Design a protein around this ligand. Structure first.
Ligand SMILES: C[C@@H](CO)CCNc1ncnc2nc[nH]c12
Ligand SMILES: C[C@@H](CO)CCNc1ncnc2nc[nH]c12
Lengths: 268, 263
């Protein structure tokens, strides 16, 4: 009840929330950095090396053995850019058809596609799926290749698991990319897309659930890219929580196109 | 005195702790990225047959990922070569295994750790037997016997003579058993992936540009032997200090940061 004890109660909330935000941000940053390395791996060992050192078996092995490097990711995969003019050739070479993500059916005719050719076994169900056949993934692919940098989706329910998460995508370019490229040049030089699923629902719960004092606190994370349309990224927004006091902790997941925040309250 | 003294202490603690965290974190990021490179050499050079990694490819990949390893001046891969294999090895590589101190052809040794892949920043390592330097040799043995990353004491690095510490990870053959004994680890050793933490230059770059640097004296000590602390960073000087914690990830070594005001 005490007013002095209430001041310390807020102090503890601030400290607990800020620490959890720092942990989330750092672990995401670590994962993004190692995804960047994998993009460079595909460029160096698949494209530049004659012949390629990377087949599906090799990609699976290397990503499984390095899974610890990418803590908030459920899996990574590499999608190759395929223009329609090339599709029949691509399918014949690979001995499979490009499929849609919603039903795993043969893709209808599209101007281009992003079929997954390499996958971590944890996301093996992505193999042959056109990652341009989901809207979140399509928008990410385009912004990745146009900006040259890592990009994040809005929160959505991921394939197979239906877990609420976000996808991270990095562009991979051909050696023909000019120095100081225009966006038009980036697009022309695009080889493909190295992506990873941040399974927020499962893996952030796992992270937070092991911390001392977790039962005392309610943690929510929001995508606030659009001020007037905040989107839940993590948490049950409306569970029994202490309505009188909250704290907002800063989060920066590294994509200037997106904005995020964490909000913590006590249970009772 | 006196309220101002309290504030002065609180500033020192904050300054020192922040510098310590920054250094530990950058070290940790580098170690993790070096572990990934050890895994890459294993996957591409040993698990694939024929090998699908070479000097050109290693140099390209390490150059492009240099940003991932902030306190490291360079990385290289040294392969385990036992004496009976030396003739075949030298014929395959078209060069002789050389000593670190003079670059002379190595006298006969039971085994050697010649650098076969190198980042171009440490190109001078190529063909050098990393067992011909005592700090590197001890590191190599402990890396292979423990199965984990290891650090040297502070010592002066090749070429630059900068004071630094070497990080080594073991790379094993697929014949390594599960829950191996140390004898099994040695027998299954393929090589050693290492790099030099150039403390003198790169930690100075990290800490020296920070606001308030002119007001404090910062040291980092290797305190593995409490009775013989060894300077890793700072001057050779021997009231109000503060000790900030550091953990660079090798249980065999211990370190600490000490900060003091000038006056
Ligand atoms: C391979 C890359 C290409 O940028 C996207 C990964 N995208 C995804 N990865 C895993 N699960 C998903 N569920 C929906 N999208 C997903
Ligand atoms: C390739 C690895 C094998 O453990 C050692 C790196 N060791 C070193 N790397 C760079 N400079 C050095 N100066 C002295 N030793 C050095």
């Amino acid at each position: 009840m005490d007013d002095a004890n209430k001041i310390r109660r807020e102090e503890v909330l601030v400290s607990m929330c800020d620490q959890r935000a720092r942990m989330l941000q750092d672990q995401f940053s670590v994962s993004v950095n190692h995804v960047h390395a994998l993009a460079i791996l595909v460029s160096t060992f698949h494209y530049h090396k004659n012949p390629s050192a990377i087949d599906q078996e090799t990609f699976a092995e290397y990503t499984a053995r390095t899974a610890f490097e990418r803590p908030l990711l459920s899996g990574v995969a590499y999608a190759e850019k395929v223009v329609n003019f090339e599709r029949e050739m691509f399918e014949r070479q690979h001995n499979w058809v490009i499929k849609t993500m919603d039903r795993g059916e043969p893709s209808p005719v599209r101007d281009e596609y992003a079929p997954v050719i390499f996958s971590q076994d944890s996301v093996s169900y992505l193999e042959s799926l056109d990652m341009m056949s989901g809207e979140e993934d399509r928008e990410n692919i385009l912004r990745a290749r146009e900006t040259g940098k890592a990009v994040l989706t809005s929160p959505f329910r991921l394939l197979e698991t239906h877990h609420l998460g976000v996808v991270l995508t990095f562009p991979v370019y051909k050696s023909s990319l000019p120095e100081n490229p225009t966006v038009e040049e980036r697009i022309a030089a695009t080889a493909g897309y190295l992506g990873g699923a941040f399974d927020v629902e499962s893996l952030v719960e796992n992270l937070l659930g092991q911390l001392a004092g977790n039962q005392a606190i309610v943690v929510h994370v929001y995508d606030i890219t659009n001020a007037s349309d905040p989107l839940v990224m993590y948490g049950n927004q409306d569970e029994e929580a202490d309505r009188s006091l909250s704290h907002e902790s800063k989060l920066d997941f590294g994509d200037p196109f997106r904005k995020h925040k964490m909000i913590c309250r006590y249970h009772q």
